[PDB]
């Protein structure tokens, strides 16, 4: 009774090591949470956008490590805002596998540094609220180093931000959100 979407950062600011962490973190979340009938969808973003599997395509292929294995990095710039808008309008459409009256969960995995994006956060957030989209943010690299980066993670996440923002390396990231 929940639709979970993954919006992962694939920009060049994300080192290949941190991308493996992203690629392994998703596998853990999908394996340690099935736990049916939770549906999963994933889209990698940069300056371009690529849907690796929709809610329909995941319902046909149960194996988590199989759908994420061939995923590579885009290496463009970082368009976080546009990625968020694309998720709520496309991935959460019933034509893609989104079920009616099911919880909409967006898991934004970024380093908290949007760049080159024509869209701002103030253009995609008020739209994500009127659609009722639960937003979790998973910071990577030095997302907690700066102040503009940490406030960006809180900006993407809903309120309160203390229940949504987590570090990627945490293996207790799933056992803390289930309860």
């Amino acid at each position: 009774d929940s639709d979970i979407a993954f919006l992962i950062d694939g920009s060049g600011s994300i080192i290949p090591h941190d991308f493996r962490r992203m690629k392994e973190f998703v596998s853990t979340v999908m394996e340690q949470l099935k736990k049916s009938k939770t549906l999963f969808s994933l889209m990698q973003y940069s300056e371009e956008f690529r849907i690796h599997f929709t809610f329909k395509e995941f319902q046909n292929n149960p194996n988590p490590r199989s759908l994420v294995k061939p995923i590579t990095q885009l290496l463009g710039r970082t368009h976080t805002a546009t990625g968020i808008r694309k998720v709520v309008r496309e991935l959460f459409n019933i034509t893609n596998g989104a079920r009616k009256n099911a919880f909409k969960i967006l898991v934004v995995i970024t380093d908290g540094e949007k760049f080159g994006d024509p869209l701002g956060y103030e253009d995609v957030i008020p739209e994500a609220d009127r659609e009722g989209v639960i937003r979790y943010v998973i910071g990577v690299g030095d997302a907690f180093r700066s102040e503009k980066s940490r406030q960006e993670l809180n900006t993407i996440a809903s309120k309160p931000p203390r229940d949504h923002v987590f570090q990627v390396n945490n293996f207790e990231a799933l056992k803390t959100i289930q309860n």
Partner: protein, 296 residues
């Protein structure tokens, strides 16, 4: 990223000797060696006693190069040979980076800049070479390039900008020449086909803040797999071009494109030195040092 181990840069300490061009070839790696080690601060694991042993070598190359300074403050291989537009612009380029290393006489540096502007700049901004250098292997990817006025103008302009602040007072026609050169590049940037010219002219535009819109898209999309600017042959040219792009990316504060570019450069394992390695040696270490200075 992590700075390059200074132990693999020992061969860059070269004793300068030769003519107006031969001396700069040996002077180049030494100047850019200590410039990199200054920023990365590796004088402790390398020996501070060796710093003066190389710093004075730069002074030696400088004084020996002054003997080939023509009365018009221009530079040629020989005192009787017609002055080269490229060599003069390269002397300005090397000296500008060494002003904080040794005592560089400002009258020499500014005199060469004034000569390039007054006598070697076409009214449309184009810089023209009327007496090419003998050692054609010291000019990097500028050797046998289809393009053209663009490549040479981009090169000279980069030198002028690196000496803009230090020679703005003496040479007043400097900001005007800079703008004129930038006007020609911006007007013909979209028509560029070779990745080398795209990289070097892109950096010249980026230093002005004139690398925007379609010019930027042209620049970024020219990159093979978003990590290097590659032309078919001559690896040394591709290293030089990618270094110019890195400098352009660092100017744009684009830290989405910087890491894969730097990562590629480090996987080439190039440490300079050898026949026809002057530009690549100077570029790959000016860029990586600028990266170290700018990397969070």
């Amino acid at each position: 990223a992590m700075a390059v181990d200074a132990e693999r840069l020992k061969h860059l300490i070269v004793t300068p000797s030769g003519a107006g061009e031969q001396n700069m070839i040996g002077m180049t790696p030494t100047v850019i060696a200590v410039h990199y080690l200054d920023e990365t601060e590796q004088w402790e694991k390398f020996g501070l006693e060796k710093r003066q042993g190389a710093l004075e070598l730069i002074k030696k190359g400088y004084t020996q190069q002054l003997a080939f300074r023509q009365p018009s403050s221009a530079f040629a291989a020989f005192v009787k040979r017609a002055p080269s537009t490229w060599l003069t612009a390269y002397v300005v380029k090397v000296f500008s980076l060494a002003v904080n290393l040794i005592a560089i006489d400002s009258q020499v540096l500014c005199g060469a800049v004034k000569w390039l502007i007054l006598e070697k700049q076409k009214p449309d901004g184009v810089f023209q070479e009327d007496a090419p250098v003998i050692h054609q292997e010291m000019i990097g990817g500028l050797r046998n390039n289809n393009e053209k006025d663009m490549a040479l103008t981009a090169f000279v302009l980069i030198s002028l900008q690196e000496a803009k602040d230090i020679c703005e007072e003496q040479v007043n026609s400097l900001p005007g020449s800079i703008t004129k050169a930038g006007d020609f590049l911006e007007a013909n940037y979209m028509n560029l086909q070779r990745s080398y010219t795209v990289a070097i002219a892109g950096y010249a535009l980026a230093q002005m803040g004139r690398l925007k819109g379609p010019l930027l898209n042209k620049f970024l999309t020219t990159a093979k797999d978003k990590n290097r600017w590659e032309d078919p042959g001559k690896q040394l040219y591709n290293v030089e071009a990618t270094s110019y792009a890195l400098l352009a990316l660092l100017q744009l504060k684009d830290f989405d494109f910087v890491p894969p570019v730097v990562r590629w450069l480090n996987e080439q394992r190039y440490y300079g030195g050898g026949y026809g390695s002057t530009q690549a040696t100077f570029m790959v270490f000016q860029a990586l040092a600028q990266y170290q200075k700018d990397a969070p």
